[PDB]
Design a protein around this ligand. Structure first.
Ligand SMILES: Nc1ncnc2c1ncn2[C@@H]1O[C@H](C[C@@H](N)CC[C@H](N)C(=O)O)[C@@H](O)[C@H]1O
Ligand SMILES: Nc1ncnc2c1ncn2[C@@H]1O[C@H](C[C@@H](N)CC[C@H](N)C(=O)O)[C@@H](O)[C@H]1O
Ligand SMILES: Nc1ncnc2c1ncn2[C@@H]1O[C@H](C[C@@H](N)CC[C@H](N)C(=O)O)[C@@H](O)[C@H]1O
Ligand SMILES: Nc1ncnc2c1ncn2[C@@H]1O[C@H](C[C@@H](N)CC[C@H](N)C(=O)O)[C@@H](O)[C@H]1O
Lengths: 342, 344, 343, 342
């Protein structure tokens, strides 16, 4: 038993690595030009952190990030990949004549053996809302192979949270749920299930983008330092928040995005998924409240976002928010493994 | 003892006649040019039905319809009005030098004593959805003064009903009710009242106009013949319907309007409140279903609109509708006395 | 009862039907200035509530009674005469407070309370403060108040100030002149033009306005709810002497009101003034039948006399004169039938 | 059980998780053609239900069991393996039918039912009829059917027809040619282009289309559910000979299906054909690896072999040739992972 298998239901792992075994899914991430181009900039503009160094690429996929490390002058790159994509990465290593520098290691990073410790770990392990897929834990786990004072690319990750107003989205999800309000669907009363239906639909995080003008307060930031954090730190993530409301109106939920920073010796390069920045394949994520909170400009909205990691490689989300001046309170539970792609 | 007081709570009647004692409210009706101009045309173009005749104006308000009867040549017009507007009507009769022909009689038509029987009764007793205010009963009651082979202006009334689709209206009402879904309004859980709030909001008929393209089937018509009907016929009004759906989609409720016809010796003149005709102060009325029914073009939507008169001079409405092909059924209760005036 | 003797049954039925609608309770509840200020007044004076006996006069949905419970009250008697009392009881149960809030259906003049109370809370303010005559019910309830008990709100201030608004004044004749025509469909309506003008002028105008139409500092009339008796509100005489800050034509008097919650920790104010965010009370304007010319530094003196009537409202008599010229005007208004002008 | 023996556990977990969502039951329920036709078939054949004993295989929300009750059934056994069984029980209670409908949680291959039934009702159809392998559960349930009993639906017809769709065929290469570039951010991707092509071609395409792309009358393969054994569905060999009505390049085979409810009063058909209003099944297209030129009046013959697999789906082996020219093509597709193109 490995740390991976201990925290992961077999059914989930099967589907997860089957997904990433598709060339079309690797293509989809590769063609996110913001993502791939920002990773290339981070590695090449910090070429001194790679020159003549030993590298680990956690979850290499096609090999693309290991190719960037080779371009930057790395002496040896261990490219670990658990899906059958590892075989395709090896094909590209050979066809690009980089067999002397990139070594594909098929398997899970929690289970493979490497010949030596490495100077720097590179990975793209970010999911929706940063934490979906639980691959940041594999990235942190890989630090067992990192030399003392080695680096991590990316180095830190910032989760941003902000309240938003969007009656249209709210009513769109409520409308779907109201199917189960019908007292005579082909003669059948469904209404005893209305409550269960509302719960189910509002447990789905909404993945899409939006106009920044729907944000009702400056975002609160929660930072994970990948040089310092341990695997276990991500099992239960408690994010307290206190928003100073800039606009009056209905708060329909919290919007989430994330940034990661590559803190290299030459420069710090940021990859942002904020709604003020060009769109990525992560979009942004919104967690709806089952009923909006009313707030005036100048009020404070206080609470906690609690993320509990689950064995399906995702998170159970609890959001409790309160308008401090009135005691108006909202408690909501979301399943990050059942998003609504809007 | 009066049939009016036997069917009306005092609280309702006081407020009702106070409302019509305002000159601003008489002006609102008078300034509906479709209404007032059509009444004048019906009376003047049928002048031989008035010439040298005896007329009763039921609920004369300012007197305006009695002035039209006098223009058509009536010999004597008894203008009955229960609100304090009766005294203003008297002022206009004197100022228009018609004291020899228009006789204002203050009081309820169920309670006054008229000096003689009349050849023709004129009135504007139509409310929202035709039947609101229960003034049609006063109009019919007044036939105790009508000679045999007398006439009624208007002579018949047609109520039209048709299914409509309007998700925006439906969502607007549901959103108001959603206030009572909040589990923490200033820290208070209101949600145990959510069902009561939805019922209250959806009990309100919606008075406004709309585009005829929201209608999903040809209207069904229910006709009241004022010459033949008895007062008691309006205590319970049962309107069955079967619509042949012309479009697929969500049926959010039934829309209602009405036409009246003045069936004179010279011509029949129609006053219509249909959404294809110029707007009147009656607009149109829509009764929402709490949950819409899905139907496809060619299906049939059948059921009953039942109006039960109440002591607040209005009706309790039950609408039951079923898509025959699927058995999807909607049952709704509306309080016609207290509509939502949505027009702006 | 005291209520039935002062109220025509017809008015009472319509009044309590109105408040029996969830939508009308919602309208008050969603007035954030009103509801939020009540909550703040009660919670920030928690020592006036903690372990105390409370009476809520006209509890509606129960909302003020829940605030008293949030502040720690031992027992709250929530009295409500409309059918809203049944909905309030449903909320007390669903909020798990049956041990602390007792809903009593009926008029506060007619129910029996089982014990005396430390504090009365109520929202009984109408347009111009006094419309609805519910302040009398609030005062009546002091038969249940212990000596040295408190009232929330504690005092009410009605403010009056002269205003200029040429367009509002002229608007009355624009409307009334519908009747000044000699052949409306053949009918000479003109004999009713005076009656129509009169009717329009008898309506107090409910809406808001720009504070720059005000021509003098307001005069204030205060009701101290701890000291006042019911009968004090049957005839309310408000003398005034305005010192005109601007020259112009005075078209009437503008009215608004404030209430203060004078607690042991602090005083909290709820204001409906035109300098403050809008409430569902707006402000109220009573026109003079004829405007009065005043110049800056003149004085405008007179009386606003409010006479309670059995329709749960007031007949308003205003008479005013410009002291330096003798120019005089008056008006009689019916507060029960205001003109809602706000758009 | 029979179900366990033929089904990979990881597949079954995902499968019954899917149907445990009210949103996925709603998706089927809101397919008006599907749900309305089942209701019509049952109510219009009311003498097949009145005072009868019924089995509903995979009752989901219970909707088909309520129709059987509307038709007058005496007792309805409603079997459901997902957690939707708990929601069906709620609806049975709230519709005052606990005396007539009994919800039996579990797989129909594993539960104990006490008595033989007069008629079995079910909606077990997947993409191109057979996907999900639930027709085998439906046929397995005949162990509970009286010798004189009936099956609703009674027969299922799968239809195949050749199509021309130049743009669909070329699209595979447009997507795969992402890999045919020598310097994607400095990397020669070209060695993976063939593997990317192969991957795309192995996915049946789920979407609808204009009937004018069809080049011949369909060939139909009928399963008589009253006669068939579940073993008949493990290997389904569909020979075809198409009489070409149009000359052109045949890019593949299009699939749809009908089912018939053959009752005592009337036969009611439910069709997913492209000439009929769209259902949630759309239609399915399988490309040949190379197009075949066929003239009007030519015959296009071959076989479509559907081989069941333990992922609750089929591998689809298609071979076709133009008899008059000898030109031949083929493909091998994985029905479990279709491309949703609509
Ligand atoms: N524990 C693990 N061990 C090894 N590979 C993993 C593990 N978890 C996820 N992966 C792989 O990590 C990859 C994550 C991708 N987001 C990144 C692919 C590639 N590095 C790129 O940036 O394009 C997938 O190809 C997964 O199959
Ligand atoms: N039972 C009644 N007896 C006498 N007047 C009544 C009665 N019911 C209603 N009214 C009056 O009937 C009038 C109805 C108005 N719709 C019409 C006013 C006027 N005839 C016009 O056409 O402009 C109002 O003035 C009511 O006060
Ligand atoms: N004499 C009375 N006795 C009991 N309730 C009354 C009386 N007069 C008015 N009410 C009620 O008092 C309430 C007054 C409302 N302004 C306040 C409702 C509620 N307390 C709130 O603050 O939202 C209405 O619900 C009236 O029905
Ligand atoms: N072997 C099985 N035993 C029991 N239920 C099953 C089995 N296989 C599939 N199901 C259920 O069968 C259902 C199939 C649905 N197509 C139909 C749902 C419902 N009968 C309706 O017609 O709307 C899903 O709810 C599955 O979870």
């Amino acid at each position: 038993r490995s740390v991976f298998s201990e925290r992961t239901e077999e059914s989930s792992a099967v589907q997860y690595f089957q997904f990433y075994g598709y060339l079309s899914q690797q293509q989809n991430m590769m063609q996110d030009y913001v993502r791939t181009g920002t990773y290339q900039r981070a590695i090449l503009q910090n070429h001194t952190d790679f020159k003549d160094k030993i590298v680990l690429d956690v979850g290499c996929g096609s090999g693309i990030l290991s190719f960037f490390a080779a371009q930057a002058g790395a002496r040896k790159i261990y490219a670990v990949e658990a899906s059958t994509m590892a075989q395709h990465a090896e094909v590209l290593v050979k066809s690009n004549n980089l067999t002397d520098r990139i070594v594909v290691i098929p398997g899970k990073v929690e289970e493979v053996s490497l010949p030596e410790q490495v100077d720097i770990i590179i990975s793209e392990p970010m999911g929706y809302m940063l934490f979906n897929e639980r691959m940041l834990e594999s990235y942190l786990h890989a630090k067992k192979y990192l030399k003392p004072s080695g680096n991590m690319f990316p180095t830190i990750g910032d989760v941003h949270l902000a309240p938003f107003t969007d009656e249209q989205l709210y009513m769109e999800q409520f409308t779907k749920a109201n199917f189960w309000y019908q007292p005579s669907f082909h003669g059948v009363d469904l209404s005893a299930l209305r409550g269960a239906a509302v719960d189910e639909y509002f447990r789905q995080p909404v993945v899409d983008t939006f106009d920044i003008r729907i944000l009702m307060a400056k975002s609160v930031k929660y930072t994970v330092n990948f040089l310092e954090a341990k695997e276990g730190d991500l099992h239960r993530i408690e994010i307290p928040f206190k928003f100073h409301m800039l606009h009056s109106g209905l708060v329909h939920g919290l919007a989430f995005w994330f940034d990661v920073a590559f803190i290299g010796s030459i420069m710090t390069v940021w990859l942002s998924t904020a709604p003020t920045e060009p769109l990525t394949h992560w979009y942004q994520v919104r967690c709806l409240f089952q009923s909006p909170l009313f707030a005036k400009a100048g009020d404070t909205l206080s609470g906690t976002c609690l993320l509990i990691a689950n064995k399906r490689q995702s998170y159970d989300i609890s959001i409790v928010a309160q308008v401090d001046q009135t005691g108006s309170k909202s408690s909501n539970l979301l399943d990050l493994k059942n998003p609504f792609f809007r």
